[PDB]
Amino acid sequence: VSTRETVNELLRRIAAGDPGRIAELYAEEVSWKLSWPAGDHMGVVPWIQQRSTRAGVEEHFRLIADHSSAEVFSVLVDGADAVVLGELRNTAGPTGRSYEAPFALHLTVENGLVTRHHVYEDSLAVFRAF
Amino acid sequence: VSTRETVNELLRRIAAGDPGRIAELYAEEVSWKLSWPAGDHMGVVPWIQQRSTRAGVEEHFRLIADHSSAEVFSVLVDGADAVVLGELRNTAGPTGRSYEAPFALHLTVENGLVTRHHVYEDSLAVFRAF
Numbered sequence: 453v454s455t456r457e458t459v460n461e462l463l464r465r466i467a468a469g470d471p472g473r474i475a476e477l478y479a480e481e482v483s484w485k486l487s488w489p490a491g492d493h494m495g496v497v498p499w500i501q502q503r504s505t506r507a508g509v510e511e512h513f514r515l516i517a518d519h520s521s522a523e524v525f526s527v528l529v530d531g532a533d534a535v536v537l538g539e540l541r542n543t544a545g546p547t548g549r550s551y552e553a554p555f556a557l558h559l560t561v562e563n564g565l566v567t568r569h570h571v572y573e574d575s576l577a578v579f580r581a582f
Numbered sequence: 583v584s585t586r587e588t589v590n591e592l593l594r595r596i597a598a599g600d601p602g603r604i605a606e607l608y609a610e611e612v613s614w615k616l617s618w619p620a621g622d623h624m625g626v627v628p629w630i631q632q633r634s635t636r637a638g639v640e641e642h643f644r645l646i647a648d649h650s651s652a653e654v655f656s657v658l659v660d661g662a663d664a665v666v667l668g669e670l671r672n673t674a675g676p677t678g679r680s681y682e683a684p685f686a687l688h689l690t691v692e693n694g695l696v697t698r699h700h701v702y703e704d705s706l707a708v709f710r711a712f
């Protein structure tokens with residue numbers, strides 16, 4: 453079924469929290485990218501690290517939940533590709549500092565499965581929270 | 583004419599540099615957003631500041647040129663809205679430090695004019711270059 457249907461189902465599963473069910477939406481192999489410097493992968497902001505498979509995606513959603521709300525402004529869809537436009541308004545577990553990060557979430561869907569997850573977000577604001 | 587045609591014309595005018603001609607593509611009033619913290623607008627990275635009108639957009643393109651290449655991976659179009667996905671690979675004028683920032687450029691087009699320009703990019707990588 454559709455690219456847009458797949459994405460809306462992803463947003464609702466993400467809003468609902470269960471990481472295993474979130475990962476169920478993801479392809480076995482996943483292209484995972486983040487607008488964070490190479491050298492700061494697995495740095496002070498802990499989820500920032502490279503990922504490659506569904507199980508990796510699962511561990512990611514378990515980890516943002518360990519270390520808060522989110523608004524979705526729009527969802528642009530153009531074929532197999534989509535961009536979720538919103539804002540993260542969370543608070544960093546360790547430092548206690550509350551932060552807001554605008555994000556654009558780029559997704560690709562093939563056969564109802566997410567094959568790409570590329571986050572573009574205010575990396576410096578998140579970083580200063582940690 | 584189309585949303586996608588308008589955008590491709592913007593990319594080519596940007597690649598060609600002339601700021602006045604770049605701004606000619608922009609609406610009189612423009613919604614201008616950046617994935618940078620509020621408190622760092624007009625900070626050490628100098629173009630990071632709020633903008634509101636065509637002339638503001640023009641000064642922006644004069645300023646990134648004062649203070650290097652760019653690749654466009656894709657352009658997603660969904661109605662009046664588009665997202666340009668690429669990477670900035672420039673080098674900071676003052677510090678000499680070379681940087682790479684992935685970006686997603688969100689655009690809205692109305693009557694062939696850009697009314698919104700919302701950049702989502704690796705703010706921390708740019709920031710560390712300055």
Ligand SMILES: O=[N+]([O-])c1ccc2oncc2c1
Binds near residue numbers: 499553557571573
């Ligand atoms: O879930 N994500 O795609 C995601 C990925 C990286 C992030 O940094 N800050 C919030 C955030 C969210």
Ligand SMILES: O=[N+]([O-])c1ccc2oncc2c1
Binds near residue numbers: 616646670
């Ligand atoms: O031109 N832009 O939309 C833009 C806006 C903000 C930027 O920060 N680093 C590169 C960059 C480019």
